[PDB]
């Protein structure tokens, strides 16, 4: 029920072996904005990777400010594999 419906699956280069969990990337984005632990789509947590889908429908906010600054939570080294339905 976002403004547009931007829905995709982005995987980061961070996992349990790195220092991140399922409640880490979730509670981070869920606490930063209005997003909730349930609102989030599918979330993955590998050894050194993790996926997540945001129902948000108006990106470009974090990519602007956090364009050079990122972390386990922020898009440090992730890529777009999904696509907006």
Curated annotation (Swiss-Prot):
Cellular location(s): Cytoplasm
Induction pattern: In response to low temperature. Induced by cold shock (42 to 15 degrees Celsius) (at protein level).
Entry superkingdom: Bacteria
Mutant lacking the gene: phenotype: Cells lacking this gene grow very poorly at 15-20 degrees Celsius, and accumulate an abnormal large ribosomal subunit and precursor-23S rRNA. A double bipA-deaD deletion has a more severe growth and ribosome phenotype than either single deletion, but the same level of pre-23S rRNA as the single deaD deletion.
Assembly behavior: Interacts with the 50S ribosomal subunit upon shifting to 15 degrees Celsius. Also found associated with the RNA degradosome at 15 degrees Celsius; binds RNase E (rne).
Function text: DEAD-box RNA helicase involved in various cellular processes at low temperature, including ribosome biogenesis, mRNA degradation and translation initiation. Exhibits RNA-stimulated ATP hydrolysis and RNA unwinding activity at low temperature. Involved in 50S ribosomal subunit assembly, acting after SrmB, and could also play a role in the biogenesis of the 30S ribosomal subunit. In addition, is involved in mRNA decay, via formation of a cold-shock degradosome with RNase E. Also stimulates translation of some mRNAs, probably at the level of initiation.
Protein name per the record: ATP-dependent RNA helicase DeaD
Organism from which the protein derives: Escherichia coli (strain K12)
Shown segment, full-protein numbering: 482 to 564 of 629
